[PDB]
Amino acid sequence: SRIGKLLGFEWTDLSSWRRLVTLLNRPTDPASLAVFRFLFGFLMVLDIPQERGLSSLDRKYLDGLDVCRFPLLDALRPLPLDWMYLVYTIMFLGALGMMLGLCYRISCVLFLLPYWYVFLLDKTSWNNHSYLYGLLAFQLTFMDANHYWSVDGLLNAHRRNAHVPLWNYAVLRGQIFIVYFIAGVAALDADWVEGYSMEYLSRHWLFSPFKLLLSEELTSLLVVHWGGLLLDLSAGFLLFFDVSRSIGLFFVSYFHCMNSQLFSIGMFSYVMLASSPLFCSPEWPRKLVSYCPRRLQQLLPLKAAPQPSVSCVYKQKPGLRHQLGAAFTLLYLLEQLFLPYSHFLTQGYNNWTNGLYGYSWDMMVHSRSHQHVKITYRDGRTGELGYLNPGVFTQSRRWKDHADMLKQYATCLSRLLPKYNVTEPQIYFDIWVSINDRFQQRIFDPRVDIVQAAWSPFQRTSWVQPLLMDLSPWRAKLQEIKSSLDNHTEVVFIADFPGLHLENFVSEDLGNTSIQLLQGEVTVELVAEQKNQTLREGEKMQLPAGEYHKVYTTSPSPSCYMYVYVNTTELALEQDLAYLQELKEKVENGSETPLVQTFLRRQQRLQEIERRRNTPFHERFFRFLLRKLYVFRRSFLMTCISLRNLILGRPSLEQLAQEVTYANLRPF
Amino acid sequence: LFIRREQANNILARVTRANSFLEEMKK
Ligand SMILES: *[C@@H]1O[C@H](CO)[C@@H](O[C@@H]2O[C@H](CO)[C@@H](O[C@@H]3O[C@H](CO)[C@@H](O)[C@H](O)[C@@H]3O)[C@H](O)[C@H]2NC(C)=O)[C@H](O)[C@H]1NC(C)=O
Ligand SMILES: *[C@@H]1O[C@H](CO)[C@@H](O[C@@H]2O[C@H](CO)[C@@H](O[C@@H]3O[C@H](CO)[C@@H](O)[C@H](O)[C@@H]3O)[C@H](O)[C@H]2NC(C)=O)[C@H](O)[C@H]1NC(C)=O
Ligand SMILES: CC(C)=CCC/C(C)=C/CC/C(C)=C/CC/C(C)=C/Cc1c(C)c(O)c2ccccc2c1O
Numbered sequence: 083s084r085i086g087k088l089l090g091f092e093w094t095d096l097s098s099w100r101r102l103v104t105l106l107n108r109p110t111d112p113a114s115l116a117v118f119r120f121l122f123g124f125l126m127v128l129d130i131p132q133e134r135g136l137s138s139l140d141r142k143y144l145d146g147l148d149v150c151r152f153p154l155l156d157a158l159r160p161l162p163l164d165w166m167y168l169v170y171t172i173m174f175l176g177a178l179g180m181m182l183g184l185c186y187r188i189s190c191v192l193f194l195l196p197y198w199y200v201f202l203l204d205k206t207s208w209n210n211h212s213y214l215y216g217l218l219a220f221q222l223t224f225m226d227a228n229h230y231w232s233v234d235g236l237l238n239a240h241r242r243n244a245h246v247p248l249w250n251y252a253v254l255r256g257q258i259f260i261v262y263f264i265a266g267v268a269a270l271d272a273d274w275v276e277g278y279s280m281e282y283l284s285r286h287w288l289f290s291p292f293k294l295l296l297s298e299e300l301t302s303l304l305v306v307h308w309g310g311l312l313l314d315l316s317a318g319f320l321l322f323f324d325v326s327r328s329i330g331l332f333f334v335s336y337f338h339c340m341n342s343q344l345f346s347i348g349m350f351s352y353v354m355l356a357s358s359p360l361f362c363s364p365e366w367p368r369k370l371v372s373y374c375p376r377r378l379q380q381l382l383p384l385k386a387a388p389q390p391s392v393s394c395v396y397k398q399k400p401g402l403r404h405q406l407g408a409a410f411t412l413l414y415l416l417e418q419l420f421l422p423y424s425h426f427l428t429q430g431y432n433n434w435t436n437g438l439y440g441y442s443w444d445m446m447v448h449s450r451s452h453q454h455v456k457i458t459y460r461d462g463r464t465g466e467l468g469y470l471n472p473g474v475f476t477q478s479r480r481w482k483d484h485a486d487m488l489k490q491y492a493t494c495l496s497r498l499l500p501k502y503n504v505t506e507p508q509i510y511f512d513i514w515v516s517i518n519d520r521f522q523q524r525i526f527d528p529r530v531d532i533v534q535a536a537w538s539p540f541q542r543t544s545w546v547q548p549l550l551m552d553l554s555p556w557r558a559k560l561q562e563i564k565s566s567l568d569n570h571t572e573v574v575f576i577a578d579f580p581g582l583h584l585e586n587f588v589s590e591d592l593g594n595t596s597i598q599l600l601q602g603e604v605t606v607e608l609v610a611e612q613k614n615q616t617l618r619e620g621e622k623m624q625l626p627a628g629e630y631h632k633v634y635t636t637s638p639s640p641s642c643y644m645y646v647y648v649n650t651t652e653l654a655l656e657q658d659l660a661y662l663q664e665l666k667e668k669v670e671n672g673s674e675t676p677l678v679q680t681f682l683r684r685q686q687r688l689q690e691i692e693r694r695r696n697t698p699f700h701e702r703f704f705r706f707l708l709r710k711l712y713v714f715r716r717s718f719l720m721t722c723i724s725l726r727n728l729i730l731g732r733p734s735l736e737q738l739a740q741e742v743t744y745a746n747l748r749p750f
Numbered sequence: 751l752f753i754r755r756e757q758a759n760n761i762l763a764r765v766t767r768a769n770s771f772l773e774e775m776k777k
């Protein structure tokens with residue numbers, strides 16, 4: 083049948099449950115699954131010391147340290163540092179066992195459990211490829227991936243070159259397709275289609291060939307955005323059908339190769355490159371080995387035909403294993419389809435985008451820019467007001483965009499402050515954000531005490547400020563204004579809600595600062611002089627430097643205004659140094675203090691940059707390998723120290739200091 | 751830990767702009 087040759091099965095196989103179970107357990111070649119298993123294990127082994135964070139465990143989980151942490155469940159706590167090193171050691175052993183094929187299921191579990199424990203301990207570390215690694219480990223735990231090229235085959239005769247069920251390939255192919263397609267659909271946002279996300283990514287030197295026929299704006303609009311959307315929406319279909327798999331392979335390989343250099347996403351691109359051949363014939367590695375020299379073949383996996391296996395169903399009544407496998411392949415894929423669109427039961431995790439970041443396949447769609455953050459507290463007994471340094475007890479900045487993390491941060495601060503003689507504190511937050519070059523605006527209500535504010539996982543947060551999407555059309559005029567400025571001038575665009583005010587201290591350096599109204603009506607107050615003046619559309623006002631001024635929004639709708647300022651101090655210093663250098667140069671040519679230190683420092687930095695630029699490519703690559711070598715060696719030595727402490731016991735303090743000094747030594 | 755009122759209300763302090771891609775491993 084045409085459908086038989088085009089889809090690999092027939093409508094008759096879906097007639098009944100027994101036929102479906104029989105089809106899903108059809109004997110298949112295990113070679114491609116084995117190659118993917120090896121590559122995935124190898125990449126996990128490489129990734130553990132670098133992005134999973136094994137080389138900074140001592141810094142992250144230092145004992146006796148005051149830190150505010152962001153776990154998914156508030157009752158989840160980390161272990162002491164030595165037990166953290168033990169957990170990471172078990173994870174590494176599991177990854178190695180998965181890569182080798184030795185004790186496949188136990189190794190899968192040993193990688194899986196620690197990985198998800200570490201993943202769920204920190205919400206601020208979630209991204210898409212870590213979630214994908216967890217998903218891949220979970221899938222492979224139930225598969226027969228150790229049936230072709232593995233130590234288990236040498237140890238057991240029944241698992242050497244044996245058939246595998248077809249749902250093993252079906253689930254992996256479905257997962258890859260889901261990744262691609264959900265990313266493509268998420269790329270249908272207006273900001274993406276209009277070219278607002280990654281508007282400056284086309285300046286990279288890799289895009290040089292395209293610029294021979296297109297302008298920079300046209301390149302960014304067409305190639306980056308539209309080509310990315312098209313690849314996402316068509317890659318799965320291109321790879322599935324075998325009349326178009328060559329073009330699909332070429333395009334996907336080029337895409338991932340470019341992405342591996344444009345961004346820093348760890349092993350994501352390499353994992354996708356390794357997953358691409360999963361759509362090819364299941365026996366492709368065996369065919370490749372077929373064309374190898376006889377002497378070489380003695381070092382390569384078997385090339386004969388696979389033997390029958392109990393896993394598959396042959397042209398018998400299916401048993402429990404086959405029915406469980408079919409049920410898994412159905413339910414898991416259905417859940418994977420549903421989850422990225424489930425942000426209507428968990429209403430407490432939506433602020434401006436949907437949900438927590440990491441399980442929706444929306445990569446590089448939204449870009450944020452923060453202008454200012456303020457934290458205020460009031461003593462519960464004395465009543466005095468104070469201000470905290472933003473991010474005082476935190477190791478990440480992701481708390482600024484999520485209400486659950488802000489609630490956790492406020493609780494941590496309220497518990498920690500009493501040890502500095504601040505009793506029953508009330509804490510207020512004031513954060514200004516801009517997403518995809520919009521007006522800067524508040525994201526949380528600045529008059530709400532977050533310590534006592536109400537938060538629930540399944541209820542929409544009350545104290546989140548709505549995003550002002552009616553002001554999006556202003557972006558063109560904003561960009562025009564910004565591009566019309568002089569090279570020593572800067573501008574900030576702000577939009578404020580009715581009934582709110584902005585209190586601003588202008589630094590003494592920022593001489594010649596002014597404010598102009600764009601929409602609505604605002605009242606500007608000079609705090610020192612106690613004077614009120616009202617502005618109208620297009621009216622500008624000069625502001626004093628080194629004083630306070632307040633902007634009240636009295637319009638019934640949000641107002642828009644911009645700040646234009648010049649750094650008077652920097653300009654004067656620059657001019658003086660320039661004249662000094664010119665005079666010295668003229669004296670040296672033949673004609674004719676902190677400033678001298680600044681001039682010499684500038685020259686010193688410039689000289690270093692010149693040498694940095696003029697560096698042989700080989701030298702740079704050599705340094706790259708040495709840096710990577712250091713990272714790995716330090717991780718290994720620290721793990722050894724912690725394991726020894728766990729087993730034998732803690733040695734003398736001087737011994738520990740010497741051991742740490744040895745571990746911290748640079749390579750070669 | 752604690753700072754002054756002049757610092758807390760300094761909106762136009764130097765420059766504050768970043769790509770802030772949640773996919774990229776910042777550190
Ligand atoms: C404080 O800084 C601002 C911003 O740099 C200065 O505004 C600038 O004002 C000058 C005029 O004094 C503008 O020059 C313009 O020239 C065109 C012709 O080229 C003319 O058509 C305009 O009417 C205007 O005279 C200049 O464009 C403008 N710069 C910006 C970026 O707005 C301001 O002068 C500074 N104040 C002090 C006291 O130095
Ligand atoms: C306007 O320009 C002046 C410089 O002419 C800016 O002053 C500089 O601000 C930076 C950033 O705060 C200072 O860098 C940091 O300051 C500490 C403490 O002084 C110093 O140890 C380090 O240099 C540190 O990185 C810098 O020192 C300071 N001065 C100079 C000579 O650069 C000023 O910030 C600008 N205006 C505004 C409102 O930002
Ligand atoms: C061959 C010819 C003539 C033209 C090619 C025309 C083509 C395809 C250009 C492609 C270069 C380009 C503009 C790449 C960035 C586009 C963006 C933002 C993709 C978003 C994205 C990112 C950033 C990732 O890291 C991903 C990782 C794994 C899986 C999916 C990923 C993904 O969807």
Ligand SMILES: *[C@@H]1O[C@H](CO)[C@@H](O[C@@H]2O[C@H](CO)[C@@H](O)[C@H](O)[C@H]2NC(C)=O)[C@H](O)[C@H]1NC(C)=O
Binds near residue numbers: 581582583612613634
């Ligand atoms: C300048 O105008 C603002 C805005 O009307 C004044 O702020 C108001 O002050 C009165 C008197 O305390 C309050 O009843 C209002 O609720 C305030 N409006 C707010 C906070 O939005 C401000 O007092 C005036 N400044 C001077 C120096 O006259």
Ligand SMILES: CC(C)CCC[C@@H](C)[C@H]1CC[C@H]2[C@@H]3CC=C4C[C@@H](O)CC[C@]4(C)[C@H]3CC[C@]12C
Binds near residue numbers: 194199216217220421
């Ligand atoms: C020591 C403790 C904390 C670790 C125990 C491991 C548990 C919590 C892990 C192991 C396998 C994991 C599951 C693997 C796959 C998925 C599918 C994904 O779409 C949502 C998360 C979910 C459902 C995971 C939830 C957490 C999980 C059940």
Ligand SMILES: *[C@@H]1O[C@H](CO)[C@@H](O)[C@H](O)[C@H]1NC(C)=O
Binds near residue numbers: 502503
């Ligand atoms: C806390 O210390 C401050 C001085 O830093 C002091 O004024 C205050 O009374 C102390 N509070 C208590 C409860 O001791």
